[PDB]
Design a binder for these strands. Structure first.
Ligand SMILES: Nc1ccn([C@H]2C[C@H](O)[C@@H](COP(=O)(O)OP(=O)(O)OP(=O)(O)O)O2)c(=O)n1
Ligand SMILES: Nc1ccn([C@H]2C[C@H](O)[C@@H](COP(=O)(O)O)O2)c(=O)n1
Ligand SMILES: [Cl-]
Ligand SMILES: [Cl-]
Ligand SMILES: [Mg+2]
Ligand SMILES: [Mg+2]
Ligand code: NA
Ligand code: NA
Ligand code: NA
Length: 326
DNA sequence: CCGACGTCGCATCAGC
DNA sequence: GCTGATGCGA
DNA sequence: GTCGG
């Protein structure tokens, strides 16, 4: 990519601020700047050129000038040398280990993959599965495998109840040639914003996917959100496929458009779009778009009959999913 | 300057 | 048990 | 760390 050196540097700084500094707004700020630079269609020649972009300020402009001149950032070169920062950054790569647990583990002398495997009984369930599949979860999924997985989930969901609709969202719906995981939005006419006429709607689907050995593990599970692990079947004498992360979100059927907007993302796109809604006097979540009175209090949900209706309310031209990869 | 920064589901814990 | 943070995640 | 009133 045109400015990959810069965007990698800013991403590394973002991860430092999240995992080590525990400064979520600096993390979001660095990621917003990396994102706007990533889509900028010129090779950046100076910090001042970058500072014209929204989300790039004085400090990041100075880092860009240092990086352009020397190929590196002294602030990062030092962070890379700090053992405590290095340990925390590694531990947070395990699903279920966040910044707080990573610093506590380091305090307790658990700092390496070997240390984690020796101390399984100090991990909660989520973290224990994250460790089991540590290597697998850092591999990406070719779109060809995403298509095979789509076929399994959609056909198995149909076998439970033909009135279910499952929609693969996330980076897949944005047309990516590879995905970090699989994200599945689920609806059923029994579950609306007005009533739940049938229990176990998510459970029935998860159970079926476990029974055909597609879902292999569970990280967390409630009435509307499943977070877990899945795996494609391999043929005779084939090496097994990597285990993959899968998220399933059951959304009230009448709120599908807000749900699919949320679950298509990207995460940075949603933050930018929701922030723009706020400036326009609206609030968006995965269920509704609601006005804000002078109150600052959300009003009643507005009618939504398409994804584009949501963009229209906030005076944005419609963006196809493939153009939301921020 | 300085308050705001997207929004919410599930797991875990503390305090009653 | 319930409720309200807090952590971690989408 | 950046933005906007
Ligand atoms: N902090 C976050 C994280 C995620 N999401 C949303 C939008 C995402 O696109 C979606 C799925 O989360 P993923 O982490 O799976 O992100 P992607 O599917 O977009 O990318 P990847 O290829 O890494 O899975 O849920 C969000 O709104 N806010
Ligand atoms: N998971 C899904 C996907 C689509 N739908 C509905 C919402 C729309 O009325 C209709 C249009 O589908 P599509 O967006 O795939 O064109 O399908 C649903 O209820 N649940
Ligand atoms: Cl909707
Ligand atoms: Cl709502
Ligand atoms: Mg995904
Ligand atoms: Mg603002
Ligand atoms: Na700027
Ligand atoms: Na983690
Ligand atoms: Na996901």
């Amino acid at each position: 990519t045109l400015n990959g050196g810069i965007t990698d540097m800013l991403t590394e700084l973002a991860n430092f601020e999240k995992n080590v500094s525990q400064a979520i707004h600096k993390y979001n700020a660095y990621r917003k700047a990396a994102s706007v630079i990533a889509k900028y269609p010129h090779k950046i020649k100076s910090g001042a050129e970058a500072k014209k972009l929204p989300g790039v300020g004085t400090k990041i402009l100075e880092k860009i000038d240092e990086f352009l001149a020397t190929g590196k950032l002294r602030k990062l070169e030092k962070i890379r040398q700090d053992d405590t920062s290095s340990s925390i950054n590694f531990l947070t790569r395990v699903s279920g280990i966040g910044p707080s647990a990573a610093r506590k583990f380091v305090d307790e002398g658990i700092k390496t993959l070997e240390d984690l495997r020796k101390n399984e009984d100090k991990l909660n369930h989520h973290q224990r599965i994250g460790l089991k599949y540590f290597g697998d979860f850092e591999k990406r999924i070719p779109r060809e495998e995403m298509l095979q997985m789509q076929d399994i989930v959609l056909n198995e969901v149909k076998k439970v109840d033909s009135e279910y609709i499952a929609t693969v969202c996330g980076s897949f719906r944005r047309g990516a040639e590879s995905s970090g995981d699989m994200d599945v939005l689920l609806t059923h006419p029994s579950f609306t914003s007005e009533s739940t006429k049938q229990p176990k709607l998510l459970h029935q689907v998860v159970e079926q996917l476990q029974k055909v050995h597609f879902i292999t593990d569970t990280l967390s599970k409630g009435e509307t959100k499943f977070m877990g692990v899945c795996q494609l079947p391999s043929k005779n004498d084939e090496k097994e496929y990597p285990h993959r992360r899968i998220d399933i979100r059951l959304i009230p059927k009448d709120q599908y458009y807000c749900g699919v907007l949320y679950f298509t993302g990207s995460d940075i796109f949603n933050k930018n779009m929701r922030a723009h809604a706020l400036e326009k006097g609206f609030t968006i979540n995965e269920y509704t778009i609601r006005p804000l009175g002078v109150t600052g209090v959300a009003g009643e949900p507005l009618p939504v009959d398409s994804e584009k209706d949501i963009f229209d309310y906030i005076q944005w031209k419609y963006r196809e999913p493939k153009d939301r990869s921020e």
